[PDB]
Amino acid sequence: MKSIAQEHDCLLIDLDGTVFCGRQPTGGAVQSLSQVRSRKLFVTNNASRSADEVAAHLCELGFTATGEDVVTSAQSAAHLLAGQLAPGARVLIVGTEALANEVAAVGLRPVRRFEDRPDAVVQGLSMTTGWSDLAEAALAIRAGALWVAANVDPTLPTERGLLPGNGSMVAALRTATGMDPRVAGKPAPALMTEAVARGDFRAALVVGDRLDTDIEGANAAGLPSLMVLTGVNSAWDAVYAEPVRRPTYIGHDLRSLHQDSKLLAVAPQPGWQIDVGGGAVTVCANDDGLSIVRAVASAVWEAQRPLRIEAGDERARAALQRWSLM
Amino acid sequence: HMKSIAQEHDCLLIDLDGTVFCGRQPTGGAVQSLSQVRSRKLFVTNNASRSADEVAAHLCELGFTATGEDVVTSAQSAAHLLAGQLAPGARVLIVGTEALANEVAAVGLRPVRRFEDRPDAVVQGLSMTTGWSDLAEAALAIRAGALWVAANVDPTLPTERGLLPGNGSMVAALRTATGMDPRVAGKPAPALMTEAVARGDFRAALVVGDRLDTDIEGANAAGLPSLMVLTGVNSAWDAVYAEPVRRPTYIGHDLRSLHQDSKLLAVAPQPGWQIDVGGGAVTVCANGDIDDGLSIVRAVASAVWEARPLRIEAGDERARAALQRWSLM
Ligand SMILES: [Mg+2]
């Protein structure tokens, strides 16, 4: 019975676009996270900061967290490597020392150039990575070194604009070497599947702003998922999402944790009558404000050319236009 | 009495790397060959890291006679391109060496290194101290509508240490970050070559190069003839199976071929080799009643180009030995 946060052991929660939007914590994020009893794990695909450094930034925004609460893709990459390299194998680092620490912390030996004999290469974003560093990695990868990337985001959003992400640095090595790296962070399920293993949790939940990492990774991990609308992807994006990227729950922001799990769920709605016609989904009337989104989403998924969403009365049109959809 | 290929031409647009020298050492007979040509020797490179004088200095060390005026770079062609569609004094963000920036300055545009300055264009070339913050600056310019030019799009820089990331790898990072492509100013874009003949009003230029996708592709794009040499990247196999736009007109071992007959070097049918094209195979036999060792390459190439991938088989022993010498089988 009761709220969704109570129905689940622990929450794997995305940071960026979910907890905080750059400088500021999200809509009622601080208030809402203090009121859950379930174990809160902060999940980030970024590998530039270390475990503590991320927790410090949370503390500066008014949240209570330490490094043991945070799950980075640098940590998951470290486990991946140690999972298939001899103890004290040499791993060439591309990225910050926060990355190289996690390599050391799993009993491997972080290295910085190709004349040292690295059995693998790990790659995460660092704002001082230069050509010289890529060149060392390029030689290593051409010689058959095992290549891991923390994440493969093409862009890094900031106040100045959309800057090059780790995926862009990976794209340079892809071109130089003609090979791909194995991706360690989201949307790979190992990151999430390990996080639940830490505290042997039997009923975990994923909360994130982004379909192609947070939600896609949840389904890959065989976990449920609550999509929030404070970040990258929109209501529209959820409706037309391809099967592997479809969330199970959907809500405004982190106040959704204290809402009823049956209310947030993507399913048919008694408040909305929907008819899938010839190339169109039609909505008539009979709520936090997202019921109609859940109604339409559910219809499209159950059912190629994208289906048009269209209105059957004044009450439908106004709600739809409020969420775009036409 | 016959006439050499170099005598038949006003000027020679000669590629540096893989053609004149191979990293440290001049290629076979390069110094002795170029010293014996009367016509104008221009040294063309797609690299935008060295200045024209720095290139010429490097050539003097290896044993060649060359000044800065003899060098044609993609950095020059990139600058000329930008000057040709930007107002004088327009700001151009530089990704690359100061030698790149100097070429931009020299055409009356203002070289720049960051997005807070308002750059109308981004020019990209390889520099070994290029870092993420430099790419970040250019990413912001490109997204803000800035005109983007690259010197070259080479995935790799070949060095003594191995294969390092070329300018094409750096571009790929911006291709991914921005979702846009640069306009290429260097080879195989014909602007580079066609402007070089304009410099001296030459009326019978020839291109010499080791690479099909740049040197040769550009020569066909510029409507110039072209000698492919086997000292560099592309081989005889590559010549044979090259698609129409990357086909050379002449083919030789190395820069010695500048003194051989153009009729001998020409990709054409050969007296010493009879060819049967049929059954998805090219059968080569030794024929009935002087070779430089490449007649069979020219015969096969000519046969393949005149006519679904095609196999190359030997009809007798002599032909098999010749074919095996150039792989081909
Ligand atoms: Mg996010």
Ligand SMILES: [Mg+2]
């Ligand atoms: Mg070359």
